[PDB]
Amino acid sequence: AMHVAQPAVVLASSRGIASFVCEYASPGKATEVRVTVLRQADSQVTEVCAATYMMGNELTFLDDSICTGTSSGNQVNLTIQGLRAMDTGLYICKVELMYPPPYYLGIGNGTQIYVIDPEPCPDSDQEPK
Ligand SMILES: *[C@@H]1O[C@H](CO[C@@H]2O[C@@H](C)[C@@H](O)[C@@H](O)[C@@H]2O)[C@@H](O[C@@H]2O[C@H](CO)[C@@H](O[C@@H]3O[C@H](CO)[C@@H](O)[C@H](O)[C@@H]3O)[C@H](O)[C@H]2NC(C)=O)[C@H](O)[C@H]1NC(C)=O
Ligand SMILES: *[C@@H]1O[C@H](CO[C@H]2O[C@@H](C)[C@@H](O)[C@@H](O)[C@@H]2O)[C@@H](O[C@@H]2O[C@H](CO)[C@@H](O[C@@H]3O[C@H](CO)[C@@H](O)[C@H](O)[C@@H]3O)[C@H](O)[C@H]2NC(C)=O)[C@H](O)[C@H]1NC(C)=O
């Protein structure tokens, strides 16, 4: 245990930019480090972004994109843009050497992404939103 570092929460900008880096630990360097980002909800949890961190290539988020992520050394950086009040929640950083056998690593418990709601008025006493 204690071989995976990830922020428990993440502060997002007003636009909705939530970016954090979940590092992982491996016995060596390989071409395939499958990463996964999940969103947890009280009713159920669903998959979101996923790609193979190839040390000589970039992650592909063609399926369920709506997100951008980077990977360097042993730290994977995930950035989210467009987080509404409902979008705010938990994001799980996953790290799995799934392609090479015989696959053995760990997943991140998850970082909560926080966002700020801008208001056209100096206070919410009237016309709150
Ligand atoms: C996570 O790491 C990024 C740095 O990653 C940069 O962008 C990634 C998508 C990868 O391609 C990396 O190879 C690249 O170095 C930290 O900052 C990020 O910097 C980039 C570069 O300035 C920002 O995106 C750029 O946007 C311009 C505008 O069109 C483009 O021209 C560039 O091609 C590039 O896409 C990116 O917005 C920025 N991330 C943020 C703040 O959203 C980032 O800070 C770090 N995360 C944290 C907070 O640790
Ligand atoms: C955040 O981390 C916790 C850590 O929980 C235990 O995880 C194991 C691997 C070990 O490190 C131990 O020291 C930790 O306390 C994750 O919670 C654990 O999750 C696993 C599955 O992901 C659970 O295993 C289950 O085991 C039962 C057998 O009793 C099987 O029937 C199930 O199929 C399953 O394999 C384990 O019970 C959980 N333990 C705890 C303490 O909760 C947690 O999943 C992770 N967050 C993420 C990535 O979602």
From Swiss-Prot:
Resulting phenotype, E96 to A/R: Strongly reduced interaction with CD80, CD86 and ICOSLG
Residue intervals annotated with topology Extracellular: 2-125
Record PTM: N-glycosylation is important for dimerization.
GO cellular component: clathrin-coated endocytic vesicle; external side of plasma membrane; Golgi apparatus; perinuclear region of cytoplasm; plasma membrane; protein complex involved in cell adhesion
Limits of the Ig-like V-type domain: 3-104
Stretches the record annotates as Important for interaction with CD80 and CD86: 98-103
Membrane-topology annotation of the record: Single-pass type I membrane protein
Compartments (UniProt record): Cell membrane
Glycosylation sites: N77, N109
Superkingdom of the organism of origin: Eukaryota
Note: The therapeutic antibody Ipilimumab competes for the binding site of the endogenous ligands CD80/B7-1, CD86/B7-2 and ICOSLG.
Function noted in UniProt: Inhibitory receptor acting as a major negative regulator of T-cell responses. The affinity of CTLA4 for its natural B7 family ligands, CD80 and CD86, is considerably stronger than the affinity of their cognate stimulatory coreceptor CD28.
Subunit-level organization: Homodimer; disulfide-linked. Binds to CD80/B7-1 and CD86/B7.2. Interacts with ICOSLG.
Disease: Systemic lupus erythematosus: A chronic, relapsing, inflammatory, and often febrile multisystemic disorder of connective tissue, characterized principally by involvement of the skin, joints, kidneys and serosal membranes. It is of unknown etiology, but is thought to represent a failure of the regulatory mechanisms of the autoimmune system. The disease is marked by a wide range of system dysfunctions, an elevated erythrocyte sedimentation rate, and the formation of LE cells in the blood or bone marrow. Genetic variations in CTLA4 may influence susceptibility to Graves disease, an autoimmune disorder associated with overactivity of the thyroid gland and hyperthyroidism.
Name of the molecule in the record: Cytotoxic T-lymphocyte protein 4
Whole-protein residues included: 38 to 161 of 223
